């Protein structure tokens, strides 16, 4: 003889946490919730092995077990001193189904087991009739559905008929009069679609509910999941009774919620509303309005103390903020449901270093309490008050790309580019987006997208410059041409608040303030910056940047694109158009000189930056079309001409010549480099030489030089040769000789599937993941817009491939270059410097390959150096 | 006591072939020659071991070792009845080092050892006093540089001083007097420059000289490529001192050189020369005109009968047609050099075949013996005669790409394409060539440059083409703007006959022969086919193509590109065109409805022509920018709406929303038939249509739908869903199933890393090694031409690598994807279709790796087969 049910009530628990394999999921739960000590309604759980028997019993209940569940029934009509089918004290139960794992297919949730014509009248003389007819025609519903086969348009049949006859739109405006005519419409559906009429007796409604609990686990949905799934060894799912409370069974009794801290701001102070007989359903409904928990102290003093301990309990042994659902039915207070609350960024770390100083988690916890989004809001604007705006919220999509923005709408990108131009703040409306309009979205202040999702372009571009965006907001139709949104006619012009971090779109100016920085904030990050294993380097190109940089973490700089150091002047582009163009290597070195001083002044102010730490300087790769104007070949060759005073005939040959198919694998990179050493010759004496003048000047310098898209080791080698030997040079003439290193970029495949032999050449490697994913994967990062959407869509792809790493394809090579690298140089450092430097999932995949650290754009930093954080805990 | 000189002569060798590691490589050679009763001079060698000691006795011969080397000296002077220092019978010796593999920084080869006054005097009464005299020179320099150190400069200074004191510009136009005052002056620089004279006994000098070979085996140069290339455990250099023997001794002596067999036809008949009473020097100089063989047999009757002897010994002994030098030196034949000869293509293959009847090779050897450019010979045009024009040889450079060609000269691209627009032949002649002018090598029948090599731009986009090409050719100097080849003034305009298969280029008009088959042929390529392992496909995309590639031997078609399908008439270009600027699915589905009987016409041509075989047609992967008309996109435009009556305004934004920055990685391959099923739907269609109406007619079609470009199973997949359901509308509208295969191209990095995924999907794989190559490279075909020259002629790469397969990096993906794929599915097919399917190195490597087929143009199937072959040998 083997038990099957286990019982369940305050502080009793027949099973424990642990029991998953036997209770299921919810049955675990529900007897470790009772074992703690808190407030849960009686109940019991029919074990998992026990559906097993049914199935080997020929779908009928084994021997005994109705008799061990009647004995379970018999503890909760005890403790509650109500019975099934008793009129006066009626038991009404909730019959729920779990497995030892979330499961499809399986019997959905089942309220109010136990109604009948003179159960629904005693009831009705406790809450309102309304209500108790209410609460039949949906038990008559669900159970004739669940647990008789019945469909459910059946019943709603019926109630479309009521409706349309009464001629009224909601079911709310049904009278309780109605209600109790439609229900005796829903007993007449059981004999219309079944010739057996709607079981009266409890303990026959449970049986039966017993049974398509069991039924349900081996059900065509059931199977078809687990089959998918190469899930074997599980024996069935448990069955979870329990019984029903109500919170509008007098002034007595009540329902509320409350987080047990404050989630906006992290205040250790219960928060939350609470309704006097009433239920859950009136209060979001809208029907009646809360009142803050403070009431329920003053008014219910003993069932106020119970929810205090309760909370207590929790915060105790979860370990965290939770998010509760209690329901005071005649003075006893009841646990229904508790989740961990949702925070702000504000309120996670609040919360996480609290709870650190209370000693109830360590620092290690602490770190994966706060999410790197949580982190992202507090990098960003924010809104003064969250909630005080709650009454202003016109509807709520997916929170895109974290941030808070305000501004007037306008429905096109064009105009957003007019509305930025001049002075004011643009909120850009569009149904969706596409490569299109870019440029009309770097001036928006915020972004909203009708249609969309976490994978949109609206959201993976937003996400790339951290601007605000929600998108994906189904509830808004946006008419282009007639210039509304329609969630309410919203005019073109109108103030409009976008919160990206909660997806909430709100009416009208709402308040906003900058990001600050705070103790908690503080200390947070200091826990974070002492488990990390990753250092946090920084992609910078200009000493204003780098600065930014150190002051938001950054350990040095990774990656300092030198063909974005010439945007400021127009003499430096002016100077760059001297050589792109020149032909006679007189002209080239010449236009190369005109360039000396402006890479050595940068690169001073970049090495005085990051005094004491390390600067990885990167050699040309340029993008040329960057670099020529708008307009016609017409327009276009008249300002090189300007520039130049090469002869028109010339420089319209010369675009000829370097114009081509595919630039992104054309000649860039070290093909440049070799092809034109005096570029290389001339970038690293830039550096050396002001790397010795800020030596001189007490500034601790330590450079690195890199080759980038490197496939070969002789390539490599040969601007190698040529550092060494400006190294000799500058040092020689300067009259001072300094440390440095040198190493390559790995963003071409073959560099990984040959690494060894790079390594012997390299003292460091670091991934280029934009140019390897492009390689990769075959997708012109400039190109990959006229199809990706469509695979995101269609299931193809899970991420922007060139937002979130890819590990099976992309990783497998970097996984590869790191592990033949090592073995062939010990004393080879490995880095990143691609865009996926900075995003948390391949922060993790980074730290698990082992590499030394990662580098990313200065905003970026605090949320890489969380992520290296979160990633050995 | 061990044996340290081993002597040889006619049948008598103390060594054997075997004894590389104690002889060295040519004491070994020099021991098997002699062993198997060749006719060499008699001499000895002084092993490695004796090297070795005489370091490890401080540089100074070893105990005994002299006596040991006299013994030897005693056995040459006995079988010659010569001895050292005799002016009536002088012994002469040629001193040469040798290890056991080749070796740079080693002795070189002294010849004439045994000269001093006395000993020239007498020699000077058999040969020409201007030859002893001549002779000594050479000697005392070689002597004072090779052995004393004495710089060759002193003795050339002397040289040069005489030459021009006496006026004149050539060492043949200095008297035999002037040559025996020479003499004095070259043993005065031994007193000048060193203070010790030459010494004039040949014992001191042989031991001097024995002394000098093994000093040269412990030389800085030696020492420094041993060290380089990590090679241990060699004791040092072997001593060959052999017995020198002349041709010019009187009217009893000569010198001759002949193949065994003829090397432009395979005739089993001596081929060569014979003069009398000369040196090979006069031979080549061209001082004197030699005979035919014919003659030596009838004034020297035992000389000839012994060479007879002689060369059946090598053919037997060697297996193979040889190509040696002989001298009779008083009617005495004395065996010089003995190299396996060059041949022809059609000598390659008759001399292999005739070998076999004659049961001296088997067939697998033979296979072997005919290099895949010897075959090359035999698919191209040919010079009737091979010597006939030997006369008129001007210059001989590299032998680019083989054939034959005949034309006029012209010094540009754009007049070669000028010249052949009007009928004639062009051969294009400039001293390099670039990517600049592709069009105008597509019409010169013919490619010459000055500057240039085996991976020149000519030599390579030449071997592409099958198109004629000497490349690198120093002897020319040519004069873009003046217009003449200076070898002799070529003008522009007259006939020069080039030979890419020996790098010859010729005087004016040649005839010319076409490819023609031969029983040789014929029979040595059933050999070929009899032991190939792999099956070589063709890549065909029209009926007349796919005709051409059976008649080469193709097993089917491996890739019939769809894309190519269309350019044939101007009604299918303008259908292309209809759908490319289609927007509306209705404008769309119409242009496709247009394509349709295109594309099913020459799919059921493609299947008739390969009835029996099977037909991997590929679906679409078009290149837009080759569809669009040339011109301004003033002029551009009008045509779009000629064809599809788009609006002006309509057709000018699609231009805009359909270029690409990097085509290549663009919207191409599977992503067009993913974002654009109907696309696909319209291909798949046509397929099964054709395939059903040709199975009607008693075809048997044997069809391969497969997916390009993909780098995600779940791509793979898509294309399959469409695939299937076409297939089913198809076989029922028409009613006959029929059996397909759907597999896909890797092409991308990621299928290759992931090729397991991949593989559970597609029933075969087929490398596209064009685009694999490009993206592991990352290498824009279009574009690598800006840099690939510097790099191939820096040493950063060693071969086209789009047309030699990258093994250790491309091949290393290759290698994976085979192996991830078979493991996951046993039934998957494996092939290529990138143009290295041709590429015979690239070919070994693909059996290595175990592919099921290769695929190639048709005219490239020959060459698969033979490759596929060579590498099962
Ligand atoms: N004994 C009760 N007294 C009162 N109200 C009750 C009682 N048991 C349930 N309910 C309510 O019935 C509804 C459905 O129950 P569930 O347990 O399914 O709730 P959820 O957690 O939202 N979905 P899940 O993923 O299936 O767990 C909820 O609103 C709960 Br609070
Ligand atoms: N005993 C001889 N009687 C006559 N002439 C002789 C004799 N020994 C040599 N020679 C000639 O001297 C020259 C140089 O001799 P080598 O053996 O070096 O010749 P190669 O094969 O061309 N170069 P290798 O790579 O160093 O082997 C050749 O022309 C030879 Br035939
Ligand atoms: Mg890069
Ligand atoms: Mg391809």
Known sequence: AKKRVFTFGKGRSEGNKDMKSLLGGKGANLAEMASIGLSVPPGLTISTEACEEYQQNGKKLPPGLWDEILEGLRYVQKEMSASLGDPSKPLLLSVRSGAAISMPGMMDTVLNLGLNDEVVAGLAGKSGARFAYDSYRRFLDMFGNVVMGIPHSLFDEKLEEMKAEKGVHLDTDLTAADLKDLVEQYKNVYVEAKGEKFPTDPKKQLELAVNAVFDSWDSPRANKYRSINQITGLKGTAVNIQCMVFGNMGNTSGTGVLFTRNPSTGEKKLYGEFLVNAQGEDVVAGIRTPEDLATMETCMPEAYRELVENCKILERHYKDMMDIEFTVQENRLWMLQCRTGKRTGKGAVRIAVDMVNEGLIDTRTAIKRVETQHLDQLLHPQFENPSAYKSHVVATGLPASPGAAVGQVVFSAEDAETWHAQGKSAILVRTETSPEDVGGMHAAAGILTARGGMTSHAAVVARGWGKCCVSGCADIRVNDDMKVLTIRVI???????????????????????????????????????????????????????????????????????????????????????????????????????????????????????????????????????????????????????????????????????????????????????????????????????????????????????????????????????????????????????????????????????????????????????????????????????????????????????????????????????????????????????????????????????????????????????????????
């Open 491 to 873: 005019k073109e012009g109108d103030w409009l608040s976008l919160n990206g971090s909660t997806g909430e779109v709100i009416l009208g100016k709402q308040l906003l303030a900058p990001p600050a920085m705070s103790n908690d904030l503080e200390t947070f990050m200091s826990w974070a910056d002492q488990v990390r294993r990753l250092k946090v380097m920084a992609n910078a190109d200009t000493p204003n940047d780098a600065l930014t940089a150190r002051n938001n973490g950054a350990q040095g700089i990774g990656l300092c694109r030198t063909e974005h150091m010439f945007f400021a002047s127009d003499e430096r582009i002016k100077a760059v158009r001297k050589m792109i163009m020149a032909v006679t290597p007189e002209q080239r070195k010449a236009a190369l000189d005109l360039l000396l001083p402006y890479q050595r002044s940068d690169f001073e102010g970049i090495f005085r930056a990051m005094d004491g730490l390390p600067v990885t300087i990167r050699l040309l790769d340029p993008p040329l079309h960057e670099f020529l104007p708008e307009g016609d070949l017409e327009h276009i060759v008249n300002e090189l001409a300007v520039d130049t005073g090469m002869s028109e005939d010339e420089i319209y040959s010369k675009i000829e010549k370097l114009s081509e198919v595919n630039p992104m694998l054309g000649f860039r990179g070290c093909r440049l480099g070799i092809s034109y050493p005096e570029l290389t010759e001339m970038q690293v004496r830039a550096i050396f030489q002001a790397a010795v003048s800020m030596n001189n000047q007490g500034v601790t310098v330590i450079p690195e030089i890199m080759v980038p898209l490197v496939g070969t080791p002789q390539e490599l080698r040969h601007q190698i040769g040529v550092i060494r030997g400006v190294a000799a040079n500058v040092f020689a003439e300067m009259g001072l000789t300094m440390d440095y290193k040198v190493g390559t970029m790995i963003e071409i495949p073959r560099a990984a599937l040959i690494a060894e032999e790079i390594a012997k050449e390299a003292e460091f490697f670091s991934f280029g993941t934009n140019d390897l994913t492009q390689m990769t994967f075959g997708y012109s990062r400039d190109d990959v817009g006229k199809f990706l959407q469509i695979y995101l869509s269609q299931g193809i792809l899970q991420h922007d491939p060139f937002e979130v790493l890819d590990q099976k394809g992309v990783g497998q090579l970097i996984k590869m270059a790191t592990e033949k690298g090592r073995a062939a140089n010990p004393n080879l450092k490995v880095g990143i410097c691609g865009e996926h430097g900075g995003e948390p999932s391949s922060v993790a995949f980074f730290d698990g390959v082992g590499l030394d650290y990662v580098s990313c754009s200065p905003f970026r930093v605090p949320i890489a150096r969380l992520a290296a954080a979160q990633v050995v805990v």
